[PDB]
Design a binder for this molecule. Structure first.
Ligand SMILES: Nc1ncnc2c1ncn2[C@@H]1O[C@H](CSCC[C@H](N)C(=O)O)[C@@H](O)[C@H]1O
Ligand SMILES: [Zn+2]
Ligand SMILES: [Zn+2]
Ligand SMILES: [Zn+2]
Lengths: 248, 14
């Protein structure tokens, strides 16, 4: 079974598909991170493209854009205005990906077209927790006997939790030999995490990243990535404390 | 001491 990202926009139809096993379980689809506690909180120097350069296919704020080079997105005030290609997170310029049911990892993501190297896939959106809120969620999810975990360290005191609210990025599985990576980008002075391919991903291939998982649980989940260099377990050999996993 | 759980750590692929 597989589904497209537009299938997640209709909660009633999705909930019915989920009951038949044709879609993953329902969660709250969000367009950007939601902070449980709000925290205290830049033009590039690109020369604007002329209309002829735009017509000829020149890229606005491409590889030489100072903001892009520092993993900062441009705002609406960019010298290239509407044409700026460095607003991918804000404009939801996602890769063409489908959500698929895997043999033993749960649901996952696959490329629906060939994806060039260094292509933005999706932003890892969720609820952003502080350390107190994180520990509360650790206990809740352990009490609920959850199998899948969706915590991602954003900063030392910001953990993204995509368990209850997020987007289809929450389906990207771990691989010990991955084809994607996280990148931390600044958008409106705030940090976000996106997934980007690290190589050409052929159409139909599962998209994976290396979680570098910090396991606090007593038991480690076996890794089913299938790589010749598989580490055997999500989290590797060592168990860490809850405090260490949460970034101190 | 939870049975399962942990935190994903972003890093640049090398
Ligand atoms: N390589 C792997 N081997 C085994 N389980 C994996 C895995 N990669 C991801 N998972 C599972 O997926 C969880 C991360 S959330 C990723 C989406 C999840 N497969 C889902 O169906 O919602 C992990 O906690 C683990 O349960
Ligand atoms: Zn620029
Ligand atoms: Zn720009
Ligand atoms: Zn593995």
């Amino acid at each position: 079974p597989s589904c497209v990202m537009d299938d997640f926009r209709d909660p009633q139809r999705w909930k019915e598909c989920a009951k038949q096993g044709k879609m993953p379980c329902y969660f709250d689809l969000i367009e950007e991170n939601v902070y449980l506690t709000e925290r205290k909180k830049m033009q590039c120097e690109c020369t604007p493209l002329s209309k002829d350069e735009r017509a000829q296919g020149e890229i606005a704020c491409g590889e030489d854009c100072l903001n892009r080079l520092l993993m900062i997105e441009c705002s609406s005030r960019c010298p290239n205005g509407d044409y700026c290609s460095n607003r991918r997170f804000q404009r939801k310029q996602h890769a063409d990906v489908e959500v698929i049911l895997t043999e033993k990892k749960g649901w996952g993501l696959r490329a629906a077209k060939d994806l060039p190297s260094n292509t933005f896939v999706l932003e890892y959106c969720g609820e952003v927790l502080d350390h107190k809120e994180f520990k509360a969620r650790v206990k809740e999810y352990a009490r609920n006997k959850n199998i899948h975990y969706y915590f991602m360290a954003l900063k030392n005191d910001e953990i993204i939790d995509a368990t209850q609210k997020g987007n289809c990025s929450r389906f990207m599985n771990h691989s010990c030999e991955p084809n994607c990576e996280t990148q931390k980008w600044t958008v409106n002075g705030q940090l976000r995490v996106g997934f980007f391919t690290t190589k050409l991903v052929p159409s139909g291939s599962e998209l994976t990243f290396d979680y570098q998982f910090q396991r606090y649980g007593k038991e480690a989940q076996k890794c089913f990535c299938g790589s010749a260099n598989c580490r055997g377990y999500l989290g590797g050999e060592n168990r860490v404390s809850i405090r260490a996993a949460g970034g101190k | 001491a939870p049975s399962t759980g942990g935190v994903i750590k972003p890093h640049r692929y090398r």
